[PDB]
Design a protein around this ligand. Structure first.
Ligand SMILES: O=C1c2ccccc2C(=O)c2c1cc(S(=O)(=O)O)c(O)c2O
Ligand SMILES: O=C1c2ccccc2C(=O)c2c1cc(S(=O)(=O)O)c(O)c2O
Ligand SMILES: [Cl-]
Lengths: 237, 234
């Protein structure tokens, strides 16, 4: 009868969520911050309590979590950060808008990437404006060459998220700790795919809403007993 | 030096403006106290400081100070550890009372005694106290044993429960080469400074750490300061 809550961060600065923000450490926009506050207020109104929180090492997710903990008066909770919950690494496309992407690689190839589970985008090369910014960022200094991506397929992203789910999060849930996870579209996709046993095609069609608490009820095998539910006023739901 | 340690004491709280004893009551920062934390964070940013792990209490005036600093230095991704052992001194029955109410009920002499005493506690927070359930029954302390959860603390009590965390969880991290930031409260930080500098009870009671200001220690491999604490800023 466990309860798990997920929350996907909202809008980031400079329209970066429509520019393959990926591993670039974009902050929330004021709008994204307000979204997180609304999500937190929904959790507060519903009287939710947590015992432990997981998030990525990207400040838009961390700030989403902080906003939520502030709203629900549980700033004292233990918080665990991991690169394994980071957004998908969009490689050389990182920072580009739709037009720039199609101009550079063509519509055909974009259609293929968009629709593919196991094809990565091109690698982020040294001439990319974010190359040293991300690859030499001190928060990833303990990662091995194989762990630090230059690019990720969705398959890759899920593959590195799920070890953390199994090794760090599952044991807490089975101890009865009430878990909050604040993360990103694709890392949360990995979790949802695992929970609901979805196909590659289905998970690629699933777009989790932003700034809205997503509630799971899990049985003793960590299988959902019902569809995911969204928290908030009747309309927003 | 072999190691570098940074301490920061949170600034003004909402109850400081009311002249009320907070102790374990979870008062938030005032707007002013929050600004103090931003200025401290900007001083750490200007000085180019990097950390590897952060410790704070389970009280939001300290936690928010920490968040404010991490935001300022662009290190929100750092591991953060919270512990009740770094909480402010527990002021027992005085909790919630302002200066006037305290002197009215207990007299100037008794407040004078409590003020300057290292080892005399204030009266206990009893079950009929207005904040008794608010503090003593708060679920964040549910894992504390009976003897661990205080009804009141002398400064000696406070130091006594802070230093185990220092010895068992912070010291090992420093000797592992981790650059530590501690964001906490006047009296718990007093505990750390007292252990570090080998100060007397008298000296530690005369020590008032500035608020919102990074306090920098340079330590040898045995964690002995090699010079006086330094304050960071303009
Ligand atoms: O172009 C891409 C793309 C390119 C390279 C790697 C991954 C993706 C990708 O994942 C993607 C894309 C477009 C859309 S969109 O036009 O339908 O909004 C998506 O939804 C979407 O997920
Ligand atoms: O009233 C107190 C007090 C009351 C009860 C227990 C402890 C203290 C105490 O420790 C204290 C006090 C006042 C001052 S102050 O008025 O000089 O700012 C202090 O500096 C200070 O340390
Ligand atoms: Cl945190």
């Amino acid at each position: 009868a466990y309860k798990l809550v997920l929350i996907r961060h909202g809008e980031s600065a400079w329209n970066l969520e429509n520019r393959f923000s990926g591993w670039y450490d974009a902050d929330l926009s004021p709008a994204g911050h307000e979204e997180a506050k609304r999500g937190g207020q929904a959790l507060r109104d519903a009287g939710y309590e947590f015992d432990i929180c997981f998030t990525s090492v990207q400040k838009r997710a961390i700030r989403t979590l902080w906003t939520v903990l502030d709203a629900i008066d549980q700033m004292w909770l233990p918080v665990v950060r991991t690169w394994r919950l980071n957004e998908r690494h969009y490689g050389g496309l990182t920072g580009l808008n739709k037009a720039e992407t199609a101009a550079k690689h063509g519509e055909a190839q974009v259609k293929i990437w968009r629709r593919s589970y196991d094809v990565p985008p091109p690698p982020m090369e040294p001439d990319h404006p974010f190359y040293s910014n991300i690859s030499k960022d001190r928060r990833y200094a303990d990662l091995t060459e194989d762990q630090l991506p230059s690019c990720e397929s969705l398959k890759d992203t899920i593959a590195r998220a799920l070890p953390f789910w199994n090794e760090e999060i599952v044991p807490q849930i089975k101890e009865g700790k009430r878990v909050l996870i604040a993360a990103h579209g694709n890392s949360l996709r990995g979790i949802v795919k695992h929970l609901e046993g979805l196909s590659e095609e289905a998970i690629m069609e699933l777009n989790l809403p932003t700034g809205i608490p997503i509630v799971y009820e899990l049985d003793k095998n960590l299988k959902p007993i019902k569809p995911m539910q969204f928290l908030g006023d009747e309309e927003t739901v």
